[model samples]
Target: GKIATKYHGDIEIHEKDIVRFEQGIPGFLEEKQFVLLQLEDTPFIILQSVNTPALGFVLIEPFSYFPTYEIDLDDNTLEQLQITGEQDVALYVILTVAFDDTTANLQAPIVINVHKRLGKQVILTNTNYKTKHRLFPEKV
Candidate 1:
């Protein structure tokens, strides 16, 4: 099937490319389908919705910048994604883009089991991360 993107125009995707969510996301709770597409010429990945082309998320491999970044799965989440091993998991954080800078939210990082193609936007309150943090370091 083909999905439309803002910058990518429209793209035909294989069934394997779709990521499934059991409980759905917070605001986008009605949909459980999404695809991961990397925007050309940019260091950003778009988590595009299957049902709504305009409903997409800008994601960054949190590990790219925050080497110390880590997420602990809740007991239910582990089963939700059928995550039995550690190697299948791929993690990313959403970025709030702006003219001057970008803010990364670490609290609820996007978690996906690449092998199973299952995903979830799990939020953590016990962690050391804040809702808003400068995605890029500033120079004085």
Candidate 2:
């Protein structure tokens, strides 16, 4: 089938391509399914909602900038996604694009069981990271 996206317009997608977020996102609890669209010639990814074309979130791989990034999933989450192996997991941080300062949401990283097409936005227990870590140097 096909779905409309905010940035990519309309495109074809498959049921297996739809990532199911059982808990939805932090604030968007009703939205349960989305497709991860990576735009070419760009460093960001779009989590495009399968139902709502206007509802989407930007994502980026934190390791490119924050090399030390890591997280541990509690027992419940591990079972929620039915995750049992490291090879099945993929992590991404939310990106809030601004005119000059693009910030990454390091506190609640997006966790995906790629092998199973399950997704979750996990709030970290660690306090060292935060929601507004600038991805680039401050503009002078």
Candidate 3:
């Protein structure tokens, strides 16, 4: 099906490509279905809602910036996403872009089970991670 996106404009997405978020995102709890789309030639990607085009989020693989980043999924989460092994998991962090700067939310990482096409944005309980981590440094 074709849907208009806030950033990417009109795009074609197949049913199989849609990710099911049973509990939806933190704020938009009713918006459950989403699709992951990549921006050409960049590390950035968009998590666009299937029904609500306006509800979209820019995402990136956190490991690229936070090398030591790690997540331990609980038994309930593992069972919900049907994650049986390590290979079935994929991780991403939401990005917040501003006029002069961009930040990635390291505290809550989006964990997905690629095989099952299920995803969840999990908030870390005890960690040094923050909601806003600068993606681009002033000097670098």
Candidate 4:
């Protein structure tokens, strides 16, 4: 299926590749359908909105940039996605890249249910994590 995007122009998305967010994202409660499309061979991906092209999320595989990410989803989330075993899941975080700096919202990560084509943005309860966690470390 051909879909329009906010940043990128028209793009082709396969029917079986749609990721369904049953409950929708935190802020975007009404929008549920989305497709993760990569921009060329770059690390960034446009989470194209199936219904509204104007609304798209710039997403990235958190583990690709930060290999040390370690967090456990709550029981509620586990039940929501019907997640079982390790190989059946893929975890990612929505990135907010700025002109001056780039950061990942560790407080809330996007989890994808591979088998069911379901995805969700989970809000972490841990206080230690901040919204604006810098991507690169400072050089000495």
Candidate 5:
């Protein structure tokens, strides 16, 4: 199937490639289906909704920037997403970009069950994580 993206032009996607967000992202609860597409040759990726053309999020593997970043998913989330083992999981953090800087929401990381094609943006509770952490922090 063909879907138009906010950043990329019309692209092809398969039904099997769709990532189902059962509870949907925080604000966009109605938009459930999405696909993770690479941004050409860059490390960045786009989490583009299959149904909504404008509904998309730029994501980055948090490990690349925050190597020490860690998340502990609650049991309910694990059972809901059917994540049985470590290999079934994939992690990403949404990026908020601007001309001067780029920040990643470390507090709310997007967790995906790669094998099952399921995803969820989980908000961490009782943590020091923040909504905006500079992706490219200046050196001292």
Candidate 6:
């Protein structure tokens, strides 16, 4: 599929790269499908448009950034995503890259179903999950 990305401009993506989110994000309910675009030789990836790449999101694996990731997911989410095992899921956090600094939205993360080719952004009801969780912790 050809997607017009905000960062990469117009690009072509294979069918295997597409990921489907049954329920779009909180605000963007209309856009349910997305593709994971990996920057050449880099950890950063763009959750680009299967339909509109220009409207893409930068994503990173939380574990790679912050090793101390121990958030508990609600049961309803597990059932909704139809996740049976930990191996079935792949986790990613949305990034907000800016001139001053780069930040990740750990409070709300996008969980992908690798087996089913599906994804969902889960918003944590818990107050502990802040919008900005430092990518690099003090210890590590």
lDDT of 4 by residue, 43-103 (tens): 8887778989898888888887778778888889988988877638877777887834778
lDDT of every predicted structure (CA atoms) = 0.85, 0.88, 0.88, 0.83, 0.90, 0.79
| lDDT (10s digit) by residue, model 2, range 1-140 | 98889999889999989999998887899999999999978878999999999998988889977998878788888888889856478899988988578899999999999988899998888579888998777765
Weakest lDDT window of 10 consecutive positions for candidate 1 = 131-140
Ten contiguous residues with the weakest lDDT in model 6: 131-140
- Choose 1 or 2, whichever is better by TM-score: 2
Each prediction's TM-score against the native? 0.89, 0.92, 0.90, 0.87, 0.92, 0.83
Task: Count backbone clashes in candidate 2.
Answer: 0
Q: Candidate 2, residue 14: CA error in Å?
A: 0.7
TM-score-superior candidate, 1 or 3 = 3
- Clash number for each model: 0, 0, 0, 0, 0, 2
Off by over 4 Å in 1: 137-139
Name the regions of candidate 6 deviating beyond 4 angstroms: 85-87, 136-140
Which is better, 2 or 4, measured by lDDT? 2
RMSD of each: 1.8, 1.6, 1.8, 2.0, 1.6, 2.8
User: What lDDT score is found at residue 70 in candidate 5?
Assistant: 84
Per-residue CA lDDT of candidate 5, range 1-140, in tens? 99999988998999899999999999999989999989889988999999988988999999989999989999988888898856579899999988358889999999999889999998888999999998777662
**Tens-place lDDT digits, model 3, residues 5-45:** 97799999998999999999999898889999888789888
Say which prediction, candidate 1 or candidate 6, comes out ahead on lDDT. 1
lDDT of candidate 6 over 1-140, digit per residue (tens): 67687677777878787788888877788888888878868888888767765688889888877677766678898888887765478889998886346678988999987887888998888557778866645465
Of 3 and 4, the candidate ahead on lDDT is 3
Q: In candidate 3, residue 32 scores what lDDT? A: 85
